[PDB]
Write a protein that binds this ligand. Structure first.
Ligand SMILES: [Zn+2]
Ligand SMILES: [Zn+2]
Length: 112
């Protein structure tokens, strides 16, 4: 699922720094990389990792320090991979505690 910026727009996962045309403001130049609007990390270059060990590993969760991509919003709000990783983890945990609580609810209902 697409991560949203605080202004509720759906952000996009990018594998290369965007062009002037991708950000709302005129002057956003991502030539030397950007800063995460949340953990303030200065991510200066996008690197291609050769690990490739993702048969069934969410790419967004594996090797968060591996800045192989980032999330950008047109508004200009950005998230490093690491910050994206923690919201996928947190949201997956909510879905798990939901399906679990739902299976337990069905069981409590259909058990005397
Ligand atoms: Zn961050
Ligand atoms: Zn935005």
């Amino acid at each position: 699922d697409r991560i949203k910026c605080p202004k509720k727009h759906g952000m996009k996962l990018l594998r290369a720094f965007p062009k002037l045309n991708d950000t709302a403001g005129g002057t956003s130049d991502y030539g030397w990389g950007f800063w995460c609007d949340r953990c303030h990390k200065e991510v200066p270059a996008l690197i291609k990792s050769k690990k490739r060990i993702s048969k069934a590993q969410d790419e967004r969760t594996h090797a968060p320090e591996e800045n192989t991509f980032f999330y950008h919003c047109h508004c200009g709000y950005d998230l490093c991979k690491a910050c994206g990783a923690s919201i996928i983890h947190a949201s997956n945990t909510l879905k798990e505690n939901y399906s679990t609580e739902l299976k337990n609810l069905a069981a409590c209902f259909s058990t005397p």
